[PDB]
Design a binder for this molecule. Structure first.
Ligand SMILES: Cc1cc2nc3c(=O)[nH]c(=O)nc-3n(C[C@H](O)[C@H](O)[C@H](O)COP(=O)(O)OP(=O)(O)OC[C@H]3O[C@@H](n4cnc5c(N)ncnc54)[C@H](O)[C@@H]3O)c2cc1C
Ligand SMILES: Cc1cc2nc3c(=O)[nH]c(=O)nc-3n(C[C@H](O)[C@H](O)[C@H](O)COP(=O)(O)OP(=O)(O)OC[C@H]3O[C@@H](n4cnc5c(N)ncnc54)[C@H](O)[C@@H]3O)c2cc1C
Ligand SMILES: N[C@@H](Cc1ccccc1)C(=O)O
Ligand SMILES: N[C@@H](Cc1ccccc1)C(=O)O
Lengths: 684, 684
């Protein structure tokens, strides 16, 4: 059944537990305030006003409301992005960003009467993203309507790889133009081999607990599993999967699966003519371009099988939209709701400042220091009781890695190489303080953060009349125009998304949404970085013409006598001249789009995911928590940012209670105690 | 033992055979002209004037000299780069490029009296790069002097990873500041595990033919290996290594090796605080930052083990300089020698034009078509007998991939999406024509090329007085200043290279040479793309200050209780203000620096490497060959470009002789017959 409201989606994934946190359903943990704080007047900083920082603010507001008369929380939120919604009370971006939730409003002079929205970052939300939908309910209510995201396969789709063309909806051969397609056949082989069957015989190549992944997904998503089953997944079976397969790439796993299927005769020689290795390779690459429901994962073939398996267990591709004009509205509404729930006990101030350094210093009550620069490069220093560092890993690195790894009598911190003013701190310890006695422990967390993999990504947009889809040369599936195109043209994945400002006259032509090497191949043509146009009134016309030129390819369709230039070239050219656009996340200060783990990376990302458990070590007294999708096992999803925020606040509560986990609610306790601790000594 | 001349290097590597072409020493094959051509007047195009194209030209000259009176070869060389040396017959680059062999001349107004050279691309040449040194002899003579390239470890070096600092020269612990260093221990573990022993017991973890790679390297390099050894490596043992390990990344292999050593007790818990998996991870990441002799291979951890193994067998890190002021002189000299060796039978014309399309068309004997655009964007169409496509894979894609995969009655080819004029070709076949009957076969080569991995890379340079190294603040080790710095600061690898224009007053401060994610992390700070400054008179001061600022880190050393800002900060800041520079290969039209194969990519790269064997099918009228390091098993080396050129010309000979391999010399025949063919034709 298709979910139709926020509440329907919310309930669908409410119990789902991810395999690295299999003892807890984050939505259940988040149902009530996470815990209790001692009486006091707290001074907290949140660095970053994206999904992570704003979810953390919301949870702090819920905590604040439980404080007794005379107590409260003050939060300073640092947000360097001048386009953040936090600083706002033709293509417009000002006020339309919340980090990587980022809209561009296409208008003709009056932004209150726009044509369309480009969703530059986050855009499609898994049904089983339970924490995402929990917060969407807080922001919009359960009754608010949602739509199926128009992914390849969800709407009529054209797929092109090499000489192969397909036109399809879903996976039922009755809905494919060629029901005998090799593409659909290889999908079945690769899906059988990776996911397997929820009932009956185990057919998957890479079992978890000796069974198909499908069977484990059903346990992870149960209300009342075995408890014993979740513990065994958490402590035994998922760790054993990691031990076996964290060194195996997705691309290698696809090839293994295809090889066995080819040997068995489930897949035929390609064309009847290619030799064994050529046939296997063709199928591997065909599947690579086709994907799992959101376009080709070829560019993602270097991720570990472990990372892919997380997405498989989550049924990640089954996605919806939010009940918004622009996705940034979600984060803005959560910010406003934070302030409302705090019931007067939370006070929030926004600083348009870039944090340059964090440390612990001095001997005062508040020892968590932040050094920042304002928009005219003036320096500021402030000390806090606790700090949540809600920025992704490459943005976190300069803040946490330049103070060394142990006690220092004095340091002059700041951006001295930029010629900016430094600040002297005394009796200095690193911010990410895992040990009082081991510089290597402090170095492990810093070095791990700095070597996480930020996947590269870019989006090319234009504005097109929706009626362009009705041109005679746009193909149809049962009378509905093709609205998604997945191709090896260099464009990778393309979408003709109806404007949300409304049938709408205009659509957002997401001409190219690329990852990893697909993005690298395009980057030389972008012209201006990270955004072309850099101005509200420019147009990235030259850039966009290079994308139309990539689509200028002769494509042969079955039964046709000759190839003609691809119809998609014609569609791209139908976009208006004004408002052509590219955003390159790679050349944004994030240094890419979102974390995806390579082989071996589990050790690094999982350390970050578990970092908040430092709060168990009472005498350590570390005041810094981290909150981003970079510090999760769902990089590239709001779910990851939100999970990491929940971890950070849970840890903060434990720390504020000097290591006492009974200060967490019963439901929230496993956020801390269901993970391996990052401090072995001291115990707690 | 250290080679001191071109000739000594040339003779050292003359016999070396790479494992994917184990039957043949390319230098031995290149000792005489590669074969014979029928009498005639050939019209050949070479697309690209880099190492691949120019070596191909040289080999065509050698062939041309053998043709009878009235015969000859006319070559049109297409070169789109306005800075190519081919079009030239403060920071100056004009005339100082040969593709990715690329110099920047720093001068103060008179380019004939410069200060230093930045080697922006190629810079360090393995001793056993036999074909490289063969051509270097052609260009410079055997007597010309060479120097050891000042790699980390070849000169006094500082290494920084997390809390770990090492100062060292070589691999003898006597010359490490800390002979008990964990870095030295992990290096020894990873060498034992990957390379093993040339004599006695086999200790490596990934054997070839059941023995350590060191033993296979000695066979591959032998003047006269045992009977059948090379054939068994080529057909059995190297294919078996690929089948086992091409799905294993380098990073995964390092972790496997470290894990076993940790379990055995060879590597201890890092300190008393880190758990087992944290210690293992620390060692894997420590080794990752240290490397194999040319700086950390952490950014290269996603390469297949097979790709690393190629470099191990080749002793890749043992490298030298060329006998030049600028490396481009090598390619320029080879171009001039090509014309000389042609003995008036080779005529060469240079076209300052960008090729947009290749195809076969029409009914004339010259059926190989190239469509190009000149500097006024005017279209040109020219037909040839044969074409050598000497450009790397992302530059080749638009040329070969937009004509479909079978016959077409007509096509209007060119850059129509750019608004440029097209040309109508009739009776069209794709250029990379593997089959007259299988679109999938034709698709395999195209799709393979387009999905090869171009490693990302960037270089940040500045000019510093060499005497800066003599300041008390620059550490000395074993009698000389530190001149190589390998670090996790974001800079990755840094070198203070004496100017070749001369002890020289100035040095090229290669402040940062990055690969892969290390480059991605920096890219947002480059300011202008692909080069800052974009003009001869500017300086990339703002960009460079962001690099200096990455060096502004408190570094604890054993020799002082109070950590100070890293000395390297001071050194970077000692560079002069003028002539600060970055070049980003990623945003160059190459879409990166050079091919490195991911897991699974052997299937694609090896297809490209073997492509020239199409010439064996006489009934197939394919006139196009490919010549670049992208189509080799040595992406990122001149050796790969040169091997691919040799393949291309060998294939061209066989095609010009209508499939007759006896037209190759005895020693060159294996360039074609020693590989698995890409077409199936009768034995013998
Ligand atoms: C191309 C792309 C596609 C995506 N698609 C989806 C999708 O379809 N579905 C989905 O669920 N998610 C998607 N995501 C992921 C989603 O956008 C992220 O998971 C989430 O927005 C990240 O939130 P965060 O708080 O971790 O970090 P960010 O969003 O990066 O926010 C960090 C904030 O900190 C600020 N900041 C950084 N450094 C400093 C500093 N030094 N001082 C002060 N302020 C600072 C930034 O300006 C920013 O506002 C996508 C993202 C991208 C880029
Ligand atoms: C950062 C870096 C570091 C390196 N380090 C080393 C090293 O230390 N040692 C080593 O041996 N090698 C090194 N290399 C590798 C070496 O530079 C390459 O292997 C070699 O130069 C590649 O030659 P090529 O002919 O394959 O391609 P290229 O050098 O890319 O030459 C292709 C030529 O074709 C032209 N061209 C492209 N497209 C078109 C078109 N459509 N029409 C017309 N002209 C066109 C280009 O302008 C260019 O001149 C390095 C390279 C880089 C970038
Ligand atoms: N959620 C994003 C980013 C992402 C891509 C692939 C894997 C994981 C995350 C998308 O669906 O495009
Ligand atoms: N030859 C180049 C590029 C390269 C790097 C790493 C591996 C292979 C090639 C260098 O030594 O920097």
């Amino acid at each position: 059944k298709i979910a139709t409201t926020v509440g329907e989606a919310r309930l669908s994934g409410i119990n789902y537990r991810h395999p690295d946190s299999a003892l807890v359903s984050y939505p259940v943990a988040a149902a009530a305030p996470l815990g209790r704080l001692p009486a006091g007047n707290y001074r907290i900083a949140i660095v970053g006003g994206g999904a992570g920082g704003i979810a953390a603010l919301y949870e702090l507001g819920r905590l604040a409301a439980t404080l007794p008369a005379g107590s409260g929380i003050d939060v300073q939120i640092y947000e360097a992005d001048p386009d953040s919604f936090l600083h706002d009370r033709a293509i417009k971006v000002r006020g339309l960003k919340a980090g990587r939730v980022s809209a561009a409003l296409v208008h003709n002079g009056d932004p209150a009467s726009g044509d369309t929205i480009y969703e530059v970052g986050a855009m499609r939300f898994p049904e089983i993203a339970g924490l995402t939908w929990h917060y969407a309910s807080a922001a919009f209510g359960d009754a608010a309507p949602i739509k199926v995201f128009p992914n390849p396969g969800k709407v009529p789709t054209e797929f092109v790889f090499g000489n192969r063309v397909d036109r399809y909806v879903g996976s039922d051969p009755k809905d494919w133009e060629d029901p005998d397609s090799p593409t659909l056949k290889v999908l079945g082989v690769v899906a059988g081999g990776l996911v397997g069957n929820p009932q009956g015989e185990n057919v998957a190549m890479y079992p978890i607990a000796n069974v198909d992944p499908a069977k484990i997904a059903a346990i992870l998503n149960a209300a009342t599993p075995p408890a014993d089953a979740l513990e065994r997944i958490q402590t035994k079976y998922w760790p054993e999967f990691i031990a076996q397969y964290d060194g195996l790439t997705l691309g290698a796993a696809v090839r293994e699966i295809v090889t066995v299927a080819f040997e068995k005769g489930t897949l035929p020689p390609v064309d009847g003519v290619l030799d064994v290795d050529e046939s296997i390779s063709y199928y591997v690459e065909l599947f690579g371009r086709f994907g799992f429901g959101t376009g080709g994962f070829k560019p993602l073939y270097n991720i570990s099988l472990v990372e892919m398996m997380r997405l498989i267990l989550w049924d990640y591709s089954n996605e919806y939209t939010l009940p918004v004009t622009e996705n940034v509205e979600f984060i803005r509404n959560l910010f406003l709701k934070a302030q409302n729930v705090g019931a007067g006990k939370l006070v929030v101030q926004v600083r348009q400042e870039r944090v340059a350094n964090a440390c612990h210093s001095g001997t005062a009550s508040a020892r968590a220091q932040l050094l920042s620069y304002d928009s005219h490069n003036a320096v500021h220093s402030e000390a806090y009781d606790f700090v949540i560092l809600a920025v992704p890993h490459d943005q976190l690195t300069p803040i946490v890695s330049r103070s060394g790894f142990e006690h220092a009598a004095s340091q002059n911190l700041g951006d001295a190489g930029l010629g900016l003013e430094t600040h002297t701190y005394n009796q200095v310890y690193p911010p990410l303080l895992l040990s009082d006695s081991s510089p290597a422990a402090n170095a492990r967390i810093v070095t791990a953060i700095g070597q996480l993999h930020m996947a590269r990504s870019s989006k090319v947009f234009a504005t097109v009349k929706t009626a362009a889809l009705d041109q005679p040369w746009v193909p149809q599936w049962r009378g509905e125009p093709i609205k998604a195109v997945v191709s090896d043209s260099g464009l990778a994945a393309s979408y003709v998304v109806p404007s949300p400002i409304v049938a709408p006259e205009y659509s957002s032509l997401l001409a190219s949404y690329t990852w990893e090497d697909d993005s690298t191949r395009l980057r030389h043509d972008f012209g201006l970085y990270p955004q072309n146009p850099a101005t509200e009134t420019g147009t990235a016309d030259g850039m966009y013409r290079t994308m139309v030129n990539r689509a200028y390819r002769y494509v042969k369709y079955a039964g046709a006598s000759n190839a003609q230039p691809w119809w998609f070239y014609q569609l791209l050219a139908e976009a208006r001249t004004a408002d052509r656009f590219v955003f390159d996340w790679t050349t944004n200060k994030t240094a890419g789009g979102f974390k995806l783990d390579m082989t071996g990376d589990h050790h690094q990302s999982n350390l970050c995911f578990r970092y908040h458990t430092h709060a168990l070590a009472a005498s350590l007294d570390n005041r810094f928590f981290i909150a981003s999708d970079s510090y999760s096992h769902l990089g590239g999803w709001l779910e990851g940012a939100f999970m990491s925020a929940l971890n950070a606040v849970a840890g903060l509560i434990v720390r504020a209670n000097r290591g006492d986990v009974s200060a967490l609610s019963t439901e929230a306790r496993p956020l801390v105690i269901g993970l391996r601790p990052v401090v072995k000594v001291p115990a707690a």
